[model samples]
Target: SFVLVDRPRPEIALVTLNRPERMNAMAFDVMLPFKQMLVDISHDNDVRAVVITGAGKGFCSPHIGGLTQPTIALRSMELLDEVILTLRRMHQPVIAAINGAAIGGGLCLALACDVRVASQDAYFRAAGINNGLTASELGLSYLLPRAIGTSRASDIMLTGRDVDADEAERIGLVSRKVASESLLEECYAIGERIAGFSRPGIELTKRTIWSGLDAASLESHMHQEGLGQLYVRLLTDNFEEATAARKEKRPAEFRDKR
Candidate 1:
C-alpha cells in the first residue's frame, strides 16, 4: 500500500505515506490514494484532527527520481497539486509530522499543513531548484514567504540548500521539534490537545486563519474576524463555557453544536 490510515485516538487520524524504501516519494499511486484518504477523513466527523507523516526514513519526496521523461514528470505534479489542495481544504487542522528529509514537493506538503512538528533529523530542501526546475511548485512560493518572510524564503528556495530541523524551527517553519525517536508521540500529543477543543470552533478557526491569508486590508480582516466571532457566539455556548472553565480551573467541556 502506498498510504496507510489509522486512528491512533478517537479524534485523531494519522495518515502515513508508506514505501519507505523510496523515501515515500509522491508518485501517482501514492498521491492518489493519499488524496482519497484525506477526502474520506474530511467527511469523518469522528476525526477532529489529522497528522500526516512518512513511514520510515524520510517524510516524502517530490518524485520517484531519475525519471528522464519531461511529460511524465510534469503530469506527476498534477497529482501532487491535488494532494496539496486537499490538505489545505480540509476543515480539520492538519499537522505535518516531518520525521526526515522533506525535499521539493515534500517541503511543499509540510507547508500546506496547518501546523508542522518535526524530528531533529528532519531536513528540508527545495530540490526542484537543484534539478534545474523552479523551486516554487505546489504552493511553496506562496506559503514559504508567508511562513518565514520573503527574504528567508527566497534564500532557502534560491540556494536549494538543506534547512535542518533546528533552523526550520528557529525560522518558524515548524512549531515543535523533538528527537526522531519521539516524533510521532509529540505529534499525537499536539493533535490530541487540539482535538479536545470544540470541533466547530476548530473548524471555523482553520477557515478563518486560511482566509486571513488573502484579506485585502486591516479593516476587511477585522470585519471578517467580527463575522466569525458573531457566528460562533450566536450559535454556541463555547465562549461561555470556556470562560467558566477557566475561572474554575478546569478543562472546557465543549459541545459539538455545529
Candidate 2:
C-alpha cells in the first residue's frame, strides 16, 4: 500500500499515514503520496472533510529520514511544504486524528487542521532544540503564534517542553483527547459530526476564520519573528552544532550563539 491510505466515504475521506517503524516520519517517499491524497480529498465533492491519522504509533515525526537523519532530503522538504500549503488552502476542513507522539513537525501538522483529536498517549514536543534543528520545517513559528497566541507560543519554543494531550487540548492544540485504544471510534464520531454540517456554510465559516487571522495587527510581531530567525540563521553560527552536540551526548552552547 502507498504511504497514505485513502478511504472515501460519501461525505468524507479518511487519509491514514501508513508507516510505523520510523514512527511515520515524513520522508520523501511517504510525503509525496500524502500530498496527492490530501489534494484529492480537498477536491472531491462527496468529501466534506478529511480525517488524517497515522496507521500505528505516531501521527508523524519530524522530517528526518529514519536512520539517515544527516543526509538532506530536498524531496522530503518539498513534499512536506506542499502538503502543508495545500492543507491550509484546501476547501474541505481538516481533522487530525493523533494517535501517539506528534512531535515537532508532526505537532504542527496537527495544528494546521481545523480540529484535532488525540489519543491518551498523544503528546506534543517542540523538539528542534533537543535535535539540533529548528521548528521551521513544520512552520511552527508561523502557525503556533496564531493558534496559541504569542506569549505562550514563545515560552513553549524557548523551553522546548513536552505538552501532553490534555495540556495540548487546553492550550488549543487539540479539540479532544480520547483513550488510546478507542482513538478510531472517537475520531470517527468527531469527523462524522463535522461532516453533518452544511458544506457551503462550513467552508465559508472556515474561510472567514482563516481570513480573520490576516486582519490581526501582527506587523510588529512578524518583524520580531524575522529577527529571531535571522539571529539563528547567521549570528548564531550554530548550524548542525546541536546535532553534533547531541550525537556526542553533550550540552550545546546556544547561549553564546544568541
Candidate 3:
C-alpha cells in the first residue's frame, strides 16, 4: 500500500505515507491514495484522534515532484489544497508525528494538524523560496505566522532555511520534541489522554480553536465559542459525572448524548 492505516490505540488512527523512495515525497502516485485515506478517516466514527507520519527515515520531502513536468506540479498543488481543508475540517483531532525532514508542502501539512510533535531527528523547511517560488502557498503564509509569529515566519520562509527539531521546539513549531525512536509513543500518549475526554468536549474545542484562528474579531469569536459551551453544558451531564467520579477516585465516564 502506498499508504497504511493502523489502530495504534482503539481511539487513535495512525496513517503513514509509505512511499519513501523520495522520503515519502508526494507525487500523484502517492498523493491520490493518501488523499483517499484522509477521506476514509474523516468519516471513521471510531477514530477519536488521528496521527500522520511518513515511512522509512523521512516524514516527507519538499514535494514538487512529478517527472519534472510543469503541468504535473500544478495538479499536485491543486490536490494538496483540498488535502489541507479536509485535514483541518475533520472533527477528530489530528497530530503530526514528524520523524524526519518535512520540507515545503510537507511542512504545510504538518502545520495544519491540531498538534505537532516531532522527533529529535526531524527537521522542517519551506523550500519554495530557493526555487524562486514564494514559500507561502497552501495556507503556509496564514498558518505559519499564526503558529509562531509574523517575524519568525517571514525569517524562515524568506531565507528558506532548514529548521531543525530543537529550534522548531524553541520557536514553537512543535509542542514536544521526543527521542527519534519514541516519536509515535509520544503522540499516542497524547492521543490516549485526549481519548479519555468527552467527544463533544474535545470536538467543540477543536472546532472552537480553528474558528478562533479565523475569527473576524474577539467579540465574534467568543460568542461562537460560548455557543459551543452552552450546547455541551445543556445537553450533557459531564460536569456532574466528573464531580462524582473525582470524589469516587475513578475516571469520569462521559456519555456524550448529543
Candidate 4:
C-alpha cells in the first residue's frame, strides 16, 4: 500500500499517512512522497485547508536505528529533516487529526500543523530525550514551549512521558478531542469553517500567527504583524474568497489550491 494517501476536496485536502503495518513509522520512500504531496498541494487553488492524520493505530514511533543498521538510520534522519522543512514552508493551514499514539517524530509532525485534533485514545510523547538526544526534524524546541509552556515542554521532552488527549488539550497541544469514530467529522467541521471564511483572511491569520511564534517582545510581534499583513494582502486568495462568499451569502467553496 502507498504510505501516503492524498485526497483533494473543493475546500480542503486530506493527507493520510498510511503505514499502519509499521505503526506509520517513517521510511525514506514514504517520506519523499509525503513532502512532494504537501508541496504540490500547497500550490493547488482548489485546496484551501488541509487535514492530516495517521491511517492506523498510531501516527509515528521514534527513529530507533540499531547498531546493525547504521546506514539506514542515518538515511531516515536525513529524509525526515527534508520533509520537516517542506512542512514548515507549506502556506496552507494544516490540521492534524491525531487518532492514536504520536511519539517522537510523530510529535514533531503534529506540532508543525496549525491545529491538532485528537481522538479520545490519542496520546503524545516527546521521546527524543529518552533516546539520549533532543527533538529533531521540526521546530520542537521553538514551537513546543510556546504551546505547552517552558516547564511543561521541558518535563515531557526530558522525561518522555505519554500525554493523554485530555491533558494535551488542557495544555493547548491539541485544540480538542473526540471519539475515535468522530475524529474525521471533527476535522471536517473545522475545515468547513475555514472554507467559509475569506481566503485571504484565513491565510493571513495563519501566517501572522506563525510569524509571531518566536517573538520575544511587543516590538517583535508588531514587526512580524506588519510584514505578514503586507505580504498577505498581495495574495488574491483572501480577497477573492471573501468577496465571493459575501455575494453568495453561503459558505464559499474554495476553488483555489496550494
Best by TM-score: 3
On residues 1-258, what C-alpha lDDT tens digit does candidate 4 reach at each position? 545555545677888888788778867666676788888888887787889888879866634446456776776676787776676667678889999999888899898888999899999988777778875446787788889899999888878889999999999999898999999889888887887765666776787777666566888788767776666556436557757778989765553332
User: What do the candidate models score in CA lDDT, each in turn?
Assistant: 0.88, 0.73, 0.88, 0.79
For 1-258, candidate 3 gives per-residue lDDT tens digits of 778899989999999988888888767666666777887888888998999999999997735554576776676678888788888888889999999999988899898899999999999999778778889888999999999999999999999999999999999999999998899999999998889988889988998898888888999888988888888888998888888999999998888763
Worst 10 residues of 2 by lDDT: 62-71
Candidate 1 lDDT by residue in tens digits, 140-239: 9999999999999999999999999999999999988899999888988888888888777788788888888878788888887788778878788888
Off by over 4 Å in 3: 62-76
Off by over 4 Å in 4: 6-9, 62-78, 135-137, 227-258
TM-scores of the candidates are 0.91, 0.73, 0.92, 0.80
Tens digit per residue, CA lDDT, model 2, 1-258 = 546545555576787777788777767665666777777767787777778888778788835646374455564566677777788878888888898888887887887787888888898888776688765556788878877889888888878888888887788777787888887777667666666654544565666566556665677556645555555556554556656778989765443243
The residue ranges of model 1 lying beyond 4 angstroms of the native Cα positions read: 62-76
Clash list (residue pairs), candidate 1: none
The weakest ten consecutive residues by lDDT in model 3 span: 62-71
Q: Judged by TM-score relative to the true structure, which candidate is superior, 1 or 3?
A: 3
lDDT of 1: 0.88
